[PDB]
Amino acid sequence: MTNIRKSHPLMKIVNNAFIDLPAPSNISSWWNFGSLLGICLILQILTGLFLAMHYTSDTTTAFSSVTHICRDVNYGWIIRYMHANGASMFFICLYMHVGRGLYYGSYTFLETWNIGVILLLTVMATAFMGYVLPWGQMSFWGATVITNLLSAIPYIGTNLVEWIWGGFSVDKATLTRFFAFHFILPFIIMAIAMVHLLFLHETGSNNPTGISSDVDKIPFHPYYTIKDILGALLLILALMLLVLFAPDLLGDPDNYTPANPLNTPPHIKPEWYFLFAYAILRSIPNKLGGVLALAFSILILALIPLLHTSKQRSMMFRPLSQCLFWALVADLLTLTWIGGQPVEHPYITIGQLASVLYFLLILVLMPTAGTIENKLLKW
Amino acid sequence: SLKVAPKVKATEAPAGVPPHPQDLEFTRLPNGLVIASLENYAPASRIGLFIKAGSRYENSNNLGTSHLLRLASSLTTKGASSFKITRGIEAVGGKLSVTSTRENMAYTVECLRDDVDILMEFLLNVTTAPEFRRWEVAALQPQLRIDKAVALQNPQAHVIENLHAAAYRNALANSLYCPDYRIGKVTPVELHDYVQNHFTSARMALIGLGVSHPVLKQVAEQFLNIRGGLGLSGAKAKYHGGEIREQNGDSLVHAALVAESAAIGSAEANAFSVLQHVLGAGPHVKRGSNATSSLYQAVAKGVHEPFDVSAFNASYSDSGLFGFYTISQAASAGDVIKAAYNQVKTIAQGNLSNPDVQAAKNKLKAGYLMSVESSEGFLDEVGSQALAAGSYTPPSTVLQQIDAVADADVINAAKKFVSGRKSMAASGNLGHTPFIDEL
């Protein structure tokens, strides 16, 4: 405080959304993931840009350039692993951002929630092409099965797969296209994320109680900047723990052998954040059904706001729905466990039952849960 | 037309203009309500509910309740909501308006005769059983300022409101609009008290045009048995006589100098009414020079600038106000008032001619006949008649009463104004406008 501050027609007023923005006081710790997601996004761009200064997309010198990054570049080994393990932190933070909206009814912000699904699709697409960049027998084959799923579409399935592949199979043509696409997509995410906030600042946050918090708003700057800074450190501590103590804990060991189209890995599987999607697709013998269920499960988020039934909004005072919510989270963990395991007789039964429960809970049990409690509250 | 081929449909014996025009049925219920229905077989049907709940009946505490009650129409009732009333009335094209004087407050509905039963039900629910929800009444408060501001755009409205304020202390001095301090201070309990005290049968009268008597009779047998209350500033009126002067820098100066005339029904009121047209109370020829207007002709000499003088005759149930209204430039405001006032003094001194009285009687008879000529004017005339009196006087009988006014009675009426206690209300640039004492 020094003057009347004069001026004002500049970009500072746009920054009032970071300083003077009203915010609920009772915002819990499940909310730093909003700022953590922004921290993760600019972290991938920062490390990714320096990775792109030594990475070459040609198949003859793609894998060998990744080795040159770690072996030769000064401090180039850490940058590769905060990039590889940051995407693990990105999807760790991404799934709690979705989970909080499910629990606290944040999907009632229809504009923000719908843009959120678009943001989810963009990152999952971006992280898919990044895995193909190292070209390491998991990049080639992980991209082989997933992209070949598009062949189940009729009258365009074969045409667009080759159009996606740039040829008859995954090869140098596909690899160069992915690196260029992997470079641009994150900058699209920044623009959408700004649009994501633009649809939220009109209505503010969503206190865990679920009631309007207009009576108890507090300034953002002195209270939540220091709360997000602490949350950022817990992210850096968690990310750096993987990088400096178990860099390959999450990544598959088979990715360290150069891609060989003539040789198939013992077990072919995507990264851990797509494993739950793999389980749903593998649960149906049909090919067209599997790809649709793979897309429907991801795209079911847009259908959630149309399934609200409870007269309340947050699950704080909905004990019946709380039991179902953690059943869905547990089932989503069962899908992750199933995806990393080979298709044999103990897992086909478990995989089909978990997948049929994943859709049954959200489509039937959860809307019926809200209706039941409405009778129990005389409204 | 052309609904089935011949469809002489309604070529009946009376049908209005053909020899039988049908009379006006008059009936008084044992409750005390008055029902009057004239069946003219016209396509348009007009039903009016006349209530003795004027702006004068408000006391000092609940001033402006009548203004809000007049605005209170088209609000939620027990039988019909605000949405249903506005949508239901407008779908059939009907029109709902609320007239309101200092003494009466008429509720009128106009629509086609095919859907008169729907309009009657809406009128009864609005008039008798209003919910007066607090939120709805609260939202209507700013309309009081909007209505008063527009209605006060005409400078003559302000003077007339001040004229009754200056002349009277009691009921009749209340303005027709909510006071500047009462906008927003009116409460739903006050409206319920006003309705429960004044909207109660014996002060009502149901008048309809183009509706059969049993339809009117059956719909009107659901009313109350209460009378009016008391009031600090409104109850029984008593003439005081004063002077109110307002300055607002306007180019044109409006002045109203009046005395105490007689109440309606009284034979002295007719003397003032014919005296009103002796002095001239409105033009008859567009852009005319007003040769027969005694007031305008008297001020014409000397004053060679724009001006306008007429005769003001406000008459009520218990008292009245008679005088002249003037409009003149502030540079010569005093001359116009004084010249017009001196002309009235000559009338009081017996300087009147029989042809002057004969012309004024002709103007009075013609002016009254055209007033009831329209569909709306006829309803208002009989509607107020059924309230002030208990019977309908045909226009022919009225013409005899006007013709039975002696020329001496006109002179005595002039003497009452000249010798009476005056009440002056002025507006505009009052630099040269005279006071009462320098009359």
Binding site: N26, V215, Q312 | -
Partner: protein, 111 residues
Amino acid sequence: MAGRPAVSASSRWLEGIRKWYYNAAGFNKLGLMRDDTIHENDDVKEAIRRLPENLYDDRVFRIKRALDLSMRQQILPKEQWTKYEEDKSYLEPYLKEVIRERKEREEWAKK
């Protein structure tokens, strides 16, 4: 959810389960009535605007203190909880009229 008070109970009576669910919901522990936690749509928001000043101001403080309790992740003492029997619907009469008004308005644009 937890064992029902009687012995274990599958579904006994109707008031017992509603009373059991009220304590399970836990909005009484924050000093909130049932209608203080409702979702504010374009209907409820109007029905709030019609609340009397004494009732509306009471609702504001009950919400204001509940957010203070949620901010500290605390609850009111055992004696300050909203009793299930003493809980009353202060918003149901106002909601019903807006239900009536909206249904009439919608059906008028349909007929």
